[PDB]
Amino acid sequence: NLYFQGHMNAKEILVHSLRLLENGDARGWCDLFHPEGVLEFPYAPPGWKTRFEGRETIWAHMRLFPEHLTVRFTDVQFYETADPDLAIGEFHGDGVATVSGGKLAQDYISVLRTRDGQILLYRDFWNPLRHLEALG
Ligand SMILES: [Mg+2]
Hints:
Layout: H1 10-22, H2 26-31, E1 33-40, E2 51-53, H3 55-60, E3 69-73, E4 77-79, E5 86-97, E6 103-115, E7 118-126, H4 128-135
Parallel strand pairs: 1-7
Antiparallel strand pairs: 1-2, 3-5, 4-5, 5-6, 6-7
The structure holds magnesium ion (MG).
InterPro entries: NTF2-like_dom_sf (IPR032710), SnoaL-like (IPR037401)
Pfam families: SnoaL_2
Family: Belongs to the PhzA/PhzB family.
């Protein structure tokens, strides 16, 4: 089976993606995106760029992730969807922002749309107040 996989579904991709971030594997995380895949932050500090189109555009902005954040996530609680290519999950992250030393305690609801095991849209909701607390 791991040598004879069908394409990951959206639940599987979200869980795997979070492990990659825990590992600091920014390249592996970006690899999960379709070449035209999109990452969005609906809630973000003002002045930030909040939509990134294309896997390699995402990479251009992700390379140094492990040098900025170490993070651990709780188990994802999924809502049951009609389509396996849509996942909506809630989870919590605890980490340390490296440059400020600030603690990050973040609460997420992620909406992922996928196709053939690749991410088309990662819509990454989180609390911008908590993110600003970590950064300061
Ligand atoms: Mg919008």
